[PDB]
């Protein structure tokens with residue numbers, strides 16, 4: 222039987238790593254991309270389809286779920302896995318990020334955040350994630366807005382570290398959760414090296430199963446994000462997974478792996494898929510464009526997904542233009558599959574010591 | 590290799606029949622329910638899922654398709670079957686019914702109907718259905734509104750019979766179509782027995798592969814519809830399929846089979862599914878109802894569909910309330926599967942000479 226949590230690194234190249242996270246509900250191949258489940262569903266996909274794309278784990282947003290059906294109700298119904306029909310690992314977010322993003326009349330304090338649906342404390346967040354039956358639980362933090370002054374970034378980071386300790390204690394106080402789930406801490410500090418160091422030190426002292434880099438992908442742009450990752454990731458414990466929250470575009474993922482990131486999530490493949498954007502190895506295309514109206518080729522010429530085996534650009538163009546549900550289904554399946562194929566190529570190239578070459582080849586073609 | 594068209598009756602009970610239609614693209618078990626494909630998709634379902642429910646044939650609406658992408662474009666892309674990924678038979682409607690329903694500034698004449706997208710003649714309709722690559726082609730007719738005076742019903746029916754002859758000639762003039770597809774005529778005459786007789790006589794004189802009962806399910810109600818079917822269906826050639834257009838609710842289907850109907854279509858399982866209505870053997874339920882919020886039972890206790898094997902009422906309730914695409918997917922798959930299971934029970938009971946008993950048992954439970 223698999224352990225609660227075991228991260229093993231099988232191969233390395235520079236700062237990049239490939240390996241596995243073993244958990245009770247399954248094995249996660251790293252670097253990993255986690256499709257996002259909002260409101261207990263990866264939009265427009267049955268869980269079996271999500272698995273068919275290659276996903277080992279999904280991210281469950283807790284924000285909508287804690288509102289409806291409610292964490293308690295989901296617990297009564299047997300937990301999130303049973304509820305939505307996904308039996309593999311689920312990483313849940315804390316709910317606090319989207320509270321700041323989607324709620325109104327929010328009021329912050331040292332205790333937590335109070336909000337009106339469109340009080341969430343570290344303790345309540347951990348409890349909600351428990352009630353959902355989360356496999357990987359995120360500490361409740363505060364994502365510092367960008368740009369931030371050094372003073373405000375420091376104050377925000379310091380609060381987040383206090384909340385990280387509270388998250389740790391709440392998690393540990395619940396026997397069933399502590400024995401069956403894992404807990405990740407989140408590094409803050411904006412773009413400031415000294416604050417990032419203090420945050421990493423605080424998190425490592427508390428001790429977590431994995432470490433996220435927070436406070437990025439919030440408007441700073443790729444150059445600045447990469448610059449911050451350059452010094453921030455080496456501050457985290459090497460022997461634990463590194464999770465870059467909310468990232469991202471294919472090129473962002475490749476660059477982040479080059480800098481030591483092991484885990485990713487974003488709504489981009491799902492959300493932009495329903496909007497008409499399809500990822501290809503020659504860069505993204507918008508299937509709504511009239512140039513695809515009679516194009517019999519698949520979305521991507523090399524993609525192994527079921528959509529590219531069966532349907533043409535012309536048909537998917539028609540579906541998206543017509544507002545048909547099947548359009549969203551096909552675009553989303555392809556995009557998630559593309560992301561998983563990207564992760565597989567990344568893992569294989571690191572394992573073979575040719576990831577640097579892959580990154581170069583990928584960029585040359587993707588941006589040709 | 591299968592013939593262009595062969596209808597064989599394997600068993601009978603009263604006016605009810607069960608058998609098969611053999612065509613080049615596949616065999617159709619009768620009595621048959623045809624899921625409706627609007628804009629080249631059965632809403633929220635991949636074709637493989639439509640087939641998995643038990644469907645042998647789908648109905649392709651031509652109205653939206655002749656507007657976008659256009660019949661000519663679909664022909665250039667290889668035809669409707671290739672376009673949407675359904676390789677089994679497709680019955681196409683003439684496009685005229687929805688022109689009267691969905692278009693504005695329509696102008697009728699003996700030549701056909703002129704309309705503004707939100708001239709369609711018998712010849713153009715048959716050509717469009719050819720360009721789509723239809724297996725069963727519907728004659729272009731006029732659905733007389735209800736109620737209709739005897740004079741207006743007569744004039745409308747007479748025009749429809751003239752259009753039926755024009756449809757026949759257009760179909761026969763095109764070698765590829767005449768050799769590979771079938772053509773159905775449509776009986777009109779409103780609720781009037783003498784006009785129904787004249788219409789049946791006219792259609793039989795022209796000669797068709799199958800005969801539809803038109804002009805019903807247009808507001809008359811079940812009692813009146815059944816009364817008209819009582820005298821109308823026996824007027825049609827016994828050795829050819831009988832198709833009741835636009836029907837319908839499960840009880841309507843059962844009663845229509847009792848009166849000699851072999852083929853059905855309606856948007857009810859697809860459309861009402863997305864709205865929240867789920868069919869069960871104990872009658873329809875609306876999954877949005879709060880009473881289902883914590884109900885762990887499947888949509889129906891006996892249903893063999895994949896949805897009822899995997900997901901609870903509680904989950905589907907949540908999805909539909911949240912406006913999630915997966916909600917529409919699951920509801921539609923179940924409803925279409927329910928309809929196919931109904932047709933299977935009908936076919937089996939006729940084959941076993943116990944259909945009368947089945948109809949009684951069905952109604953007693955469905956309306957309990």
Ligand SMILES: O=c1[nH]cnc2cc3nc(NCc4cccs4)[nH]c3cc12
Pocket residue numbers: 314318322362363364365407434435436437438439466467468
């Ligand atoms: O520090 C963080 N803490 C907890 N959750 C996060 C989620 C995050 N998502 C993004 N970027 C993606 C976006 C989602 C919505 C606006 S930007 N950056 C993120 C940072 C954090």
Ligand SMILES: O=c1[nH]cnc2cc3nc(NCc4cccs4)[nH]c3cc12
Pocket residue numbers: 682686690730731732733775802803804805806807834835836
């Ligand atoms: O005589 C007909 N001719 C050609 N198409 C039809 C389609 C039909 N669909 C219904 N009823 C279902 C409805 C669809 C829209 C409003 S009622 N009745 C129908 C009658 C006809």
Ligand SMILES: [Zn+2]
Pocket residue numbers: 520521524525526527528529555556558559
């Ligand atoms: Zn693909």
Ligand SMILES: [Zn+2]
Pocket residue numbers: 888889892893894895896897923924926927
């Ligand atoms: Zn079912």
